[PDB]
Design an enzyme around this catalytic site. Sequence first.
Site, mmCIF file in Angstrom:
data_model
loop_
_atom_site.group_PDB
_atom_site.id
_atom_site.type_symbol
_atom_site.label_atom_id
_atom_site.label_comp_id
_atom_site.label_asym_id
_atom_site.label_seq_id
_atom_site.Cartn_x
_atom_site.Cartn_y
_atom_site.Cartn_z
ATOM 1 C CE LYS A 41 -4.660 -7.452 -1.417
ATOM 2 N NZ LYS A 41 -3.795 -6.426 -0.734
ATOM 3 C CG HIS A 52 -1.919 -1.212 1.201
ATOM 4 N ND1 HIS A 52 -2.929 -1.467 0.311
ATOM 5 C CD2 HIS A 52 -1.871 -2.276 2.071
ATOM 6 C CE1 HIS A 52 -3.541 -2.552 0.694
ATOM 7 N NE2 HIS A 52 -2.924 -3.096 1.760
ATOM 8 C CG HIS A 86 -6.408 -4.834 7.191
ATOM 9 N ND1 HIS A 86 -6.733 -5.713 6.149
ATOM 10 C CD2 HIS A 86 -7.570 -4.298 7.666
ATOM 11 C CE1 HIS A 86 -8.019 -5.672 6.030
ATOM 12 N NE2 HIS A 86 -8.585 -4.874 6.946
ATOM 13 C CG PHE A 87 -5.873 0.110 2.665
ATOM 14 C CD1 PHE A 87 -7.209 0.145 2.253
ATOM 15 C CD2 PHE A 87 -5.082 1.219 2.586
ATOM 16 C CE1 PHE A 87 -7.798 1.284 1.793
ATOM 17 C CE2 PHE A 87 -5.695 2.402 2.057
ATOM 18 C CZ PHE A 87 -6.993 2.398 1.613
ATOM 19 C CG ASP A 88 -11.172 -2.324 7.221
ATOM 20 O OD1 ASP A 88 -11.112 -3.546 7.264
ATOM 21 O OD2 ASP A 88 -12.205 -1.749 7.621
#
EC number: 4.6.1.18
Length: 124
Positions: A41, A12, A119-121
């Site tokens: 992904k 990210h 983590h990217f939510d």
Amino acid sequence: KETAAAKFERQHMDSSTSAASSSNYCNQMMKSRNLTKDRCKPVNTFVHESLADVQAVCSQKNVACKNGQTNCYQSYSTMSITDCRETGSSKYPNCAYKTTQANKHIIVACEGNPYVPVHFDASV
């Protein structure tokens, strides 16, 4: 092995650019960050801000993650982001992605000491 915090930065962060500069960004980036190695992904967000401005969100607005977890934080400000989504033309090993450029608030999950994103939510 790679830490969750280093995995966040590899998947990210793209401080090196202010925005995606062509419709090819995503295929280039998804590939070079090793995200198409075992499979494609499906969705991935890149953030075009400084790493400190992204690490600081872990002290902004606390919000439940999509899954119900209480360790998520929403950025007080909008950030320049690039969403990469897999295309109908995508066939492993040739992952193909659509590049979308936007300015939105981001939501990340933090953990550890120092408490950084893991983590990217979502983007909002």
